[PDB]
Amino acid sequence: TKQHAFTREDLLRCSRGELFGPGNAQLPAPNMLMIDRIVHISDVGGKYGKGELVAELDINPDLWFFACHFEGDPVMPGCLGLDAMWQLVGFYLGWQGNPGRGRALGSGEVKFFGQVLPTAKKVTYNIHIKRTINRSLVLAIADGTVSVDGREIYSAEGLRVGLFTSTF
Amino acid sequence: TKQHAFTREDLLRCSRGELFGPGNAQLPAPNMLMIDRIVHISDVGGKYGKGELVAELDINPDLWFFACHFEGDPVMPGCLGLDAMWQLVGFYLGWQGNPGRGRALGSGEVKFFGQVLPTAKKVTYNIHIKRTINRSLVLAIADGTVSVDGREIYSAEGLRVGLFTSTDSF
Ligand SMILES: CCCCCSc1ncn[nH]1
Ligand SMILES: CCCCCSc1ncn[nH]1
C-alpha cells in the first residue's frame, strides 16, 4: 500500500494537504519547507528496527535565508535543519495512515557542530524512528542527524512529534 | 554592558553589524530575526544570578511564516521560537563585550506544549543565563521559556551559544 520515495512535487502536494488528505499531516510550503525530496522511507529497519527516513535539500547561494543570516557571513540557520527533522517525523506519522495535524513536541539533546555554507551542494537528513505510541494521543520519537556533502553537522536525540485530531 | 533595553531599530542596527562592530555578534535580519525588542537585559539577577533577558515579538496574521505553515492551519513554527532564544543568548554574549561571531551550539531538553496562532498579540521570551565559560572558546548556557499573551508554551533547558573569533574553527 506504500510509496517509499517522494519528489519535490509529491512534497508540495503534501503541503497543500492533498497527499494525506484534509485534517491529516501536512508539510509546510516554501519558505518553511526544508526538504526537496524524500529518497527513502520505510517502517522497518533503521537504527532501532522501527523505520527510517533519508531526505535531501539542494543548496545554492540564492536560498533566501543566506541573505538575512547573516549579512557578510551567510550560513544556514540550525533551527531550519532542526525543523526539517521534525518535518520528516511528522511526514512519517501521516504516511503510516494515522489521522490528525502534526505538531512538534520537542526533543532531548540537540547539537550543532558544523555549518552549511552557500558553497555547499546538498544537505541530507537521516532519521531513525525509535518508538511510536498509539495510545489516546499518537506520537513518534526519533533520533536524527543532518549532513552536508557527506559531513555530519547536527544531531538531535529524542525528537518528538505528535498528531492531533482536534487542534494546544 | 551599559544599555539595558533595545528597540527594533537597535536590533536592525545589530543585524547590520553596527551595534557590536565587525566580526562580533550579529542578530539575523528579517525574515530570520524573531525579536521586535529587548525589554530588559542585565548580567545580574535572573533565576541563577548570572543575568536575564526579556524580549518581545509582536504577532499579526500577515507574518510570513503563517501563510506557508500551514495552508489551512496557520501556526508559528516552534523552531522559530526556539531560534529566538538562541538569538537572544548570542546577543547577550556580544553585549558583554566579547569578540567573535555567534553560532548556536544546541540545547538539552526542549518542550513545546502550546502554540502561537495568528490571532495572538505578543510573544514574550524570558532567558536565564546559567553559566558563562571564558576558556579557549567563549560560550553561554541558559534556560529559556517562550510565552504567548501571558501563557507559557515552550521551554528549553541548556541552550548553548558560542562565539568564534577569526581563528576559531567550524
Ligand atoms: C545565535 C543565532 C543562531 C543562528 C546560528 S544556527 C547554527 N548553525 C550552525 N551552528 N549554529
Ligand atoms: C508535522 C510538522 C512538524 C512541525 C510542527 S512545529 C510546532 N508548532 C507548534 N509546536 N510545534
Swiss-Prot record, chain A:
Main location: cytoplasm
Catalysed reactions, semicolon-separated: a (3R)-hydroxyacyl-[ACP] = a (2E)-enoyl-[ACP] + H2O; (3R)-hydroxydecanoyl-[ACP] = (2E)-decenoyl-[ACP] + H2O; (2E)-decenoyl-[ACP] = (3Z)-decenoyl-[ACP]
Cross-referenced CDD domains: FabA (cd01287)
A single cellular component GO annotation: cytoplasm
Any one Pfam family match given in the protein's UniProt record, by short name: FabA
UniProt xrefs under NCBIfam families: fabA, PRK05174.1
PANTHER family referenced in this protein's UniProt entry, alphabetically: 3-HYDROXYACYL-[ACYL-CARRIER-PROTEIN] DEHYDRATASE (PTHR30272), 3-HYDROXYDECANOYL-[ACYL-CARRIER-PROTEIN] DEHYDRATASE (PTHR30272:SF8)
Family: Belongs to the thioester dehydratase family. FabA subfamily.
Subunit architecture: Homodimer.
HAMAP family, sorted: FabA
Protein name: 3-hydroxydecanoyl-[acyl-carrier-protein] dehydratase
